[PDB]
């Protein structure tokens, strides 16, 4: 090591991503850090609703007898899939909305159950994030052409053992979707926050942004998207009002001169980056420490 620099200041951070100790004079793009308190905003269309609960129960215990071994693999395993019956065939969801719940019934201390993704294209716990399917079926026995999610038993600071698997089969489509849970008293049809960075799932489109009210009066559709595919706005079917969506942290530009940051171009009227003065320019705001008594 010859010398080091700490990526703590504005100028030092710009040197760390530029991977150089000297930054040539010019204009550099940058992005503010995203907040972490992101609320959840959900918009959905009211349709014929029936809710199915896919509940998986995992329970095991050590073989009771003359040997009180604890680190050994469990000997008795009892895995059930709620209303699953082997002779009836796989448990296929046949309603519009559903949720998946994992119930651990093991009482042994330091022992816990878990489920892995395996070769499936989705995780058992993440299906509740508005995932779309044309059909979905769950079974405790092998399903042809499906995928398997391994079930594991874990000991604290000790190696874990496989205790079975869950078999899932699916097809693409928009008839069945997975919702988190029917809480008694939450209007999941239209519950959004405004003027704050929030995570949204609006009409089956997920992203992070800011929602606001625009006077636009488009008559066609309920969802408006850009060429990139990103959602630019949506319409409330009960109101008639159209809301716009903006990214939380749009890029800015920093002016560097003689290894120092002298100004910044901004899209908002904030004295950002510690500058004490801000001026209004024809197509952006400009913030700097300048006194505007210069000519060169």
């Amino acid at each position, epitope marked *: 090591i010859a010398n080091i620099i700490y990526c703590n200041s504005v100028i030092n951070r710009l040197r760390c991503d530029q991977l150089s100790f000297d930054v040539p004079d010019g204009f550099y793009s940058t992005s503010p850090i995203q907040p972490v308190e992101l609320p959840v905003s959900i918009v959905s269309l009211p349709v014929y609703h029936k809710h199915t609960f896919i509940v998986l129960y995992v329970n095991f215990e050590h073989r009771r007898g003359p040997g009180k071994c604890y680190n050994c693999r469990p000997a008795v395993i009892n895995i059930t899939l709620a209303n699953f019956n082997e002779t009836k065939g796989p448990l296929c969801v046949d309603t519009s909305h559903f949720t998946t719940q994992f*119930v651990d019934n093991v009482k042994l201390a330091r022992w816990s159950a878990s489920i892995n993704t395996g070769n499936c294209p989705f995780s058992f*716990g993440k299906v509740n994030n508005f995932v779309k399917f044309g059909s979905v079926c769950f079974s405790l026995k092998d399903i042809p052409g499906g995928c398997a999610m391994p079930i594991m038993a874990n000991l604290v600071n000790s190696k874990s053992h496989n205790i079975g698997s869950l078999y899932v089969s699916w097809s693409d489509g928009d008839v069945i979707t997975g919702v988190p849970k029917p809480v008694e008293g939450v209007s999941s049809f239209m519950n959004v926050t405004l003027n704050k960075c929030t995570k949204y799932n609006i009409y089956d489109v997920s992203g992070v942004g800011v929602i606001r009210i625009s006077n636009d009066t488009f008559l066609n559709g309920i969802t408006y998207t850009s060429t990139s595919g990103n959602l630019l706005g949506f319409k409330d079917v009960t109101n008639g009002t159209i809301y716009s969506i903006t990214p939380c942290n749009p890029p800015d530009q920093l002016v560097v001169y003689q290894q120092a940051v002298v100004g910044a171009m901004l899209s908002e009227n904030f004295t950002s980056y510690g500058f004490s003065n801000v001026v209004e320019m024809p197509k952006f705001f400009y913030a700097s420490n300048g006194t505007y008594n210069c000519t060169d």
Partner: antibody, heavy 124, light 106 residues
């Protein structure tokens, strides 16, 4: 793994009290919390418990209906709502930590507490 | 579920093979843990699952039993062993504590 509580004092019967407990030095969301109090000259009486995700809430028979248990995983804080005080709630309260780590997508058993706090008493 | 700790108090000398038992009134199988309670301090975990020694406790403690009667024995009494003891079951979410015992010095 440090636990510290606050909110003790003297409250008239039937009012309200906002107890609190703070946790640090471990992944807070993976462990179920519990609330327990020791009456003067009595043993330990379980008050309430909360799952790591906060989805399931349990209470004792005397605790049931009077108080609500809540937790905030964004700041590693455990909250309790003392409502409808009686004279028998005069005791010291401890917040405990379960020993079994569980995934946030799973509900599970509890009962083997290993680490406790320091104890904030209340009077009524 | 009711649990009884007996005797509520006993005195012993340094080196005695102290033993304490508590009943459960129900088939708890193996779901019990023991606690250490120094007055003026919060409790600490001694043995879980009725037979496992916690990594933070000296190896001079041992417990065993199955069904409804469970036992906790001390190999030999040391000067810091003087403290309140408690058994607690976790076979049900509405868990209960025992009557509590107060060991004493001789």
């Amino acid at each position: 793994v440090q636990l510290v509580e606050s909110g003790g004092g003297l409250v008239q019967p039937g009012g309200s009290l906002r107890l609190s407990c703070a946790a640090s030095g471990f992944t807070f969301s993976s462990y179920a919390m519990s609330w327990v109090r020791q009456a003067p000259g009595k043993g330990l009486e379980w008050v309430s418990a909360i799952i790591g995700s906060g989805s399931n809430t349990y209470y004792a028979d005397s605790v049931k209906g009077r108080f609500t248990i809540s937790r905030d995983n964004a700041k590693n804080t455990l909250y309790l709502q003392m409502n409808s005080l009686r004279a028998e709630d005069t005791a010291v309260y401890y917040c405990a930590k379960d020993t079994t780590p569980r995934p946030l997508y799973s509900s599970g058993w509890y009962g083997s507490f290993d680490y406790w706090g320091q104890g904030t008493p209340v009077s009524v | 579920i009711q649990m009884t700790q007996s005797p509520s108090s006993l005195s012993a000398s340094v080196g005695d093979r102290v033993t304490i038992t508590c009943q459960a009134s129900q088939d708890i199988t193996t779901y019990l843990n023991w606690y250490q309670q120094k007055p003026g301090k919060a409790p600490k975990l001694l043995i879980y699952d009725a037979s496992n020694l916690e990594t933070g406790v000296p190896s001079r403690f041992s417990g065993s039993g199955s069904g409804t009667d469970f036992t906790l024995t001390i190999s030999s009494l040391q000067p810091e062993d003087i403290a309140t003891y408690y058994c607690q079951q976790y076979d049900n979410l509405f868990l209960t504590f025992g009557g509590g015992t107060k060991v004493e010095i001789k």
